[PDB]
Design an enzyme around this catalytic site. Structure first.
Site, PDB file in Angstrom:
ATOM      1  N   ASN B   9      35.120  45.086  30.489  1.00 45.91           N
ATOM      2  CA  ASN B   9      35.876  44.387  31.522  1.00 45.91           C
ATOM      3  C   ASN B   9      34.883  43.827  32.535  1.00 45.91           C
ATOM      4  OD1 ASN B   9      37.196  44.577  34.441  1.00 45.91           O
ATOM      5  ND2 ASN B   9      38.852  44.164  32.982  1.00 45.91           N
ATOM      6  N   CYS B  14      42.110  39.190  31.931  1.00 45.83           N
ATOM      7  CA  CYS B  14      43.508  39.529  31.683  1.00 45.83           C
ATOM      8  C   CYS B  14      43.758  39.827  30.210  1.00 45.83           C
ATOM      9  CB  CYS B  14      44.432  38.402  32.153  1.00 45.83           C
ATOM     10  SG  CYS B  14      44.338  38.035  33.916  1.00 45.83           S
ATOM     11  N   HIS B 253      47.599  45.322  34.403  1.00 44.42           N
ATOM     12  CA  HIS B 253      46.743  45.970  33.416  1.00 44.42           C
ATOM     13  C   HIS B 253      47.171  45.537  32.017  1.00 44.42           C
ATOM     14  CE1 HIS B 253      44.818  49.941  31.770  1.00 44.42           C
ATOM     15  NE2 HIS B 253      44.014  48.900  31.643  1.00 44.42           N
ATOM     16  N   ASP B 270      42.162  49.928  25.406  1.00 46.56           N
ATOM     17  CA  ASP B 270      42.163  49.673  26.841  1.00 46.56           C
ATOM     18  C   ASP B 270      40.723  49.314  27.202  1.00 46.56           C
ATOM     19  OD1 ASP B 270      42.614  49.466  29.522  1.00 46.56           O
ATOM     20  OD2 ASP B 270      43.123  51.579  29.840  1.00 46.56           O
TER      21      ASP B 270
END
Lengths: 10, 335
Positions: B9, B14, B253, B270
């Site tokens: 990240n 997004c 998230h 994730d």
């Protein structure tokens, strides 16, 4: 209508 | 851990990370991407070269993968760039670049073969006998959620007949203004179906976009044969759920649930953390209700094409020239 978040598109 | 690596990240990408994994485990597409003649391309200007780099890193690297080169490649650097667009538009950008680069090559036509379907858009008046059958191709389907309980109702709404009556009548030209019906019917369904759900609608006199956290059900197996004008035995329109792109929060998230092998062994991606998860967490827990965490994209694979779409990919399928170029860039980064 929109699928993701963000500013309006209409 | 799980044999799968995550993505770093590094900014407001997004949905991008979630999309990339979904594209990475489209094994036929990945093998197609590996063979693109990008030898002469500019490293910091070629989107296909960036995609090859990202796929190679996801397949080989043990550390989380970065996407700065990719994001620079397709030029989304303005503050609202990812917020201004949807996942369909980013996927279209990536796949259009890939397909165009594949033009005039030995791997041409992979994108239409995997994601293109055929559709009929019809307009027929009740008063006069005239008929228009404009035929359209699609690579993604945006289903409506508001008021729809599940995928079946959303598809029914998609092919629903719309009445063009007074003050909105259809101009039939020689027949003059006429009351008519407008609709859409499905001819074919692609081996890989990209369904995107519409979870954000404009609200006047309010904050201009409210999140639709309403409950919406999707099945592991999706029978869509009834929505085709003409069906075909020995190739029914039965689809197996492959990817669930999920968003938490409001106007967030972004997390992707994926069973890469189609065996029902689901995993949660994730960003840099990839773990094993139950089917309930991937499917049931993302329908929505009254929380904020619900699915926004579904990726289905036709049961008759699973093995071909999900071909096993070995480290030999990557061309050695591309491997040498990527290794050279890695060497320069190491120095």
């Amino acid at each position: 209508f929109r699928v993701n978040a963000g500013p309006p598109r209409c | 851990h799980t044999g799968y690596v995550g993505l770093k990240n590094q900014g407001a990408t997004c949905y991008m990370n979630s999309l990339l994994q979904t594209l990475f485990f489209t094994n036929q597409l990945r093998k197609a991407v590996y063979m693109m003649p990008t030898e002469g391309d500019d490293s910091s200007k070629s989107v296909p070269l960036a995609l090859q780099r990202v796929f190679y890193e996801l397949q080989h690297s043990d550390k989380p993968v970065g996407t700065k080169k990719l994001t620079k490649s397709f030029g989304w650097e303005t503050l609202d760039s990812f917020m201004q667009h949807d996942v369909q538009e980013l996927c279209r950008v990536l796949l259009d670049n890939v397909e165009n680069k594949m033009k005039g090559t030995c791997v041409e036509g992979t994108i239409p073969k995997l994601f293109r379907g055929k559709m009929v858009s019809y307009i027929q008046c009740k008063e006069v006998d005239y008929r228009s059958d404009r035929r359209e191709d699609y690579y993604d389907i945006q289903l409506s959620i508001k008021g729809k309980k599940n995928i079946f109702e959303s598809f029914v709404d998609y092919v629903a007949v719309e009445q063009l009556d007074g003050d909105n009548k259809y101009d039939a030209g020689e027949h003059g203004l006429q009351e008519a019906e407008k609709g859409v019917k499905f001819l074919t369904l692609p081996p890989v179906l990209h369904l995107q759900l519409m979870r954000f609608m404009y609200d006047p006199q309010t904050d201009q976009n409210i999140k639709i956290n309403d409950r919406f059900e999707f099945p592991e197996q999706l029978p869509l044969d009834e929505f085709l004008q003409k069906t075909d035995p020995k190739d029914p329109a039965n689809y197996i759920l492959h990817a669930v792109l999920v968003h938490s929060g409001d106007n967030g998230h972004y997390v992707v649930y994926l069973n890469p092998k189609g065996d029902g062994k689901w995993c949660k991606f994730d960003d840099d953390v990839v773990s094993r998860c139950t089917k309930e967490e991937a499917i049931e827990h993302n329908y929505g209700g009254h929380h904020c965490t619900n699915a926004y994209m579904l990726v289905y694979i036709r049961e008759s094409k699973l093995s071909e779409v999900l071909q096993a990919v070995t480290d030999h399928d990557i061309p050695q020239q591309l491997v040498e170029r990527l290794q050279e860039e890695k060497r320069i980064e190491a120095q």
